[PDB]
Structure formats: C-alpha cells, structure tokens
C-alpha cells in the first residue's frame, strides 16, 4: 500500500521548563517575631544553613 | 482550709485582671503589647471586624 496524498498536521505539545523560585526565612517562620524564641533557634542555625 | 481557684486564660473576654498599670496605645511601631495578658510584639493597626 503506497500513499497517494498527504496531510500537514500541526501538533501542540507543552513542556514545563521551570517552577516558581521560593525563599524561606527560618527566623520569622519558626520564631515569628519573639526574641526569646529566636535565641533558642541559634543552636539549630546549622540546619537553616542547610 | 482549702480553696481551689479555677479559671481559663487567653480564650475569652476577661473581667478579673492583675495589678498592672495600663499604658497609652502606640500604633505603627515594633512594640511589645499586652492585651488582657496576651503578650507578644508586632505592629498595631485599626480595621473592621464583626
């Protein structure tokens, strides 16, 4: 079976390229605005540096 | 002679209060507030809530 005609088909495909960049502040997330809590968070500072 | 005082805190309107002297309200500044015993810090402002 040999074709005797043709069609020019345009297909659309979508690909995600990136996602929303995000940043997090340990101090104001965990220890919202209290100094007493933020002092206790210093010993865990390494974790946030991760 | 035994007296058992029972109360709850920082959940409903309060009529019994400690012997702390109040202070004139200061808005729009990082102040440490104390409203009916609920301490903390932040910035006060006005709004409309029912």
UniProtKB/Swiss-Prot annotation, chain A:
Per the UniProt entry, the effect of residue 4 to I is: In strain: Alpha/B.1.1.7
Question: Which residues pair up as cystines?
Answer: 26-48, 31-37
Q: Carbohydrate attachment sites? A: 5
Q: Lineage, please?
A: Viruses, Riboviria, Orthornavirae, Pisuviricota, Pisoniviricetes
Q: What is this protein called?
A: Spike protein S2
Q: What is the top-level taxon of the source organism?
A: Viruses
Q: What does this protein do?
A: Precursor of the fusion protein processed in the biosynthesis of the S protein and the formation of virus particle. Mediates fusion of the virion and cellular membranes by functioning as a class I viral fusion protein. Contains two viral fusion peptides that are unmasked after cleavage. The S2/S2' cleavage occurs during virus entry at the cell membrane by host TMPRSS2 or during endocytosis by host CSTL.
Portion of the parent chain present: 713 to 762 of 1273
């Amino acid at each position: 079976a040999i074709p005797t005609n043709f069609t020019i088909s345009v297909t659309t495909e979508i690909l995600p390229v990136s996602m929303t960049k995000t940043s997090v502040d340990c101090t104001m997330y965990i220890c919202g605005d209290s100094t007493e809590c933020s002092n206790l968070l210093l010993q865990y500072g390494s974790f946030c540096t991760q | 002679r035994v007296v058992v005082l029972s109360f709850e805190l920082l959940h409903a309107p309060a009529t019994v209060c400690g012997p702390k002297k109040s202070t004139n309200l200061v808005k729009n500044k990082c102040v440490n507030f104390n409203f009916n015993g609920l301490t903390g810090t932040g910035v006060l402002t006005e709004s409309n809530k029912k």
